[model samples]
Target: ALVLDPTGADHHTEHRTLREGGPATWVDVLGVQAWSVSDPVLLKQLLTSSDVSKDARAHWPAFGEVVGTWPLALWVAVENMFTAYGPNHRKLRRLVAPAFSARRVDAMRPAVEAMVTGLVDRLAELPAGEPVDLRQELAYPLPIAVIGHLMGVPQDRRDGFRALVDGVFDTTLDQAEAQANTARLYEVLDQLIAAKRATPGDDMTSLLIAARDDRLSPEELRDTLLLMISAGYETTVNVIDQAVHTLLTRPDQLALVRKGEVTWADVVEETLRHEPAVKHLPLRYAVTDIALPDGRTIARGEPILASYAAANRHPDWHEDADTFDATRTVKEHLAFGHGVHFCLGAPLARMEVTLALESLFGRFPDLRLADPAEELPPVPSLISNGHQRLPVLLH
Candidate 1:
């Protein structure tokens, strides 16, 4: 029985799934905070080979309904999500991939530098001893500002709207609340489209609408904007939070970065490896039954989860696989993903995270979390892997 039980316990599961997967896989559905990732190979295989299509992404809202959205109303909210993001997912991905290209991202250096510095200055303004939620002041706002310019969303409208955006991705949301917020999001997007269509700008949103000159539909415009709105900023924001949380937890690593012993790029990459902001990445559904060398076969229609968090820790891939060594030589980390749906904005995310770390470190060489980390609000439910708040005390 012990050998046969995958969970080893009566319920047969664990939480650090700290995030999500299948019915058989959800450890303690409600109470647990974070848990270890389930199967790295399963995750790696899902990422490395799974067909990139909306079939799997289609199921995400169902999972969300169970975990975050209202169970009964989950499908409606999920439908809105698909309508909002599905159509341009492929097109936006193609256009944005080039925009986020290594060169294009590198070109963003000056702007990134300015934005990051601006946020750090805000942190410096917080009264020294009083705790300021860096997550609130810096992590969340900074990325919004950066992606705002990149995607053509106006930051002024969202100048003080960290909560709505933050809560949308929060894992704790039940179906009803999730749907309510999701509806509001649609209203916001509608307003953005109206503004962009009327006064074209140099942002991604304007750039995207211009594609209509080539025959893209109004729906595609909405879909493209939807992806940029959610994906453009969400992952970057979380990774920033994830990197900062890890650094604050490991002071020696932070000090090493502070002393220039490790480049900000190095620190950011290592953090992506150690405590990945996006734990479940390259999610998919097997278009058809696919078998692996390990004799595991993913059946058609099964929602596949590729664990970026787990892959970064694969024993087969690195030396001391679990250690957060910023100096470790790169060996094909899957933090961005692999195969068909590799992130279109990886270069952009990398560039921004690098600048964020470097600028934050430069501003406050003695940065520390203001709140007892253990007491910090938990990351949004299982699907959301970032912090609810990061109060850093810049000493």
Candidate 2:
């Protein structure tokens, strides 16, 4: 079986290997076996197919086989819409989707813009020629702050909250550490729930609590908030991280945007395709045997891993797919996913990255990498794709 690199050191190479293995290949993800799909069209079909399900507990026979031993157990164990299937998925989505609707996210623009401006202004104040980690200073702060506010997480609790969320994505953790991290996350979430219950607010947390009677169960409410905060924060942070890194490395691409040849939206779309924040999302099970066009069949109860980053750059879907061309005509990708589980926060994420890039570049046109782009270390996870620290000289 093809084992994924948990350190994410050679994603492009690994993706090439997966692609060469055909549309879907059996691979080892943190000791568990699954069919890894790297083809764009096939991935799209699998994503939307009713034959496949994200609900591990309901559809997966091996759910108990891994249980506490699997490092990625927290992923499938989360009792939210993300891991739910069929009617349960629809019910959770219906209750959770409204909080991320267009009106609500658009209403957050001024606040998000304010948050961006504040961070940019502070970065501008740093001593001239001093190196700064944009991942820390800019990319990491905005989304966490925005999602924290939306979910009513108090300011002081966010750092610890952020750390715990990072743990969830770090597939390198041993089973004991991973289990401990999951428990800590739940404790923090329970605290937040307690806080919201004691003092209701205009935020999504309170709103979800209000609907808990008929719509959401207590576990669903906690996990729903968990999904919103964790997913909303991490994904957006990486998009900003990758977009800035791409533009800085490929100045010619940046020049296209500067010359009005390509829009910021184009930059965001291209970054998503060339280097999606999530390389692989875990643990979808086949409800029944899923036959592939290539004469392979994913047996029922088998796990499926969607290789979004590989699929986004699949040669079958785009011309010169490996190249990061912002002006490319074909921009479709599985970055925010496809089908019913498509990200609710997609619009907000796009807006945040667009604003972060436009403002950061507008402020420091001369900003350059402190270290070579290729040398910057990646976040230590097969699941999350981003640099560990984006050090740059803000001029």
Highest lDDT among the candidates is held by which one? Answer: 2
Q: In candidate 2, what are the lDDT values of residues 295-363, reduced to their tens digit? A: 888999999999999888777799999888988877898998899999888988898999888899999
Give the worst 10-residue stretch by lDDT in candidate 2. Answer: 369-378
Stretches of candidate 1 off by over 4 Å are: 1-52, 56-92, 159-161, 258-260, 292-296, 371-374
List, residue by residue over 313-377, the lDDT tens digit for candidate 1: 66656778777787776745767665545666777788888888878877887778776635665
Candidate 2: clashing pairs of residues: none
Model 1 TM-score? 0.78
**Backbone collision tally, model 2:** 0
Top model number, TM-score? 2
What shift in Å separates residue 57 of candidate 2 from its native position after superposition? 1.1
TM-score of each: 0.78, 0.98
Model 1, C-alpha of 131: deviation from truth (Å): 2.0
Question: Worst lDDT window (10 residues) for model 1?
Answer: 1-10
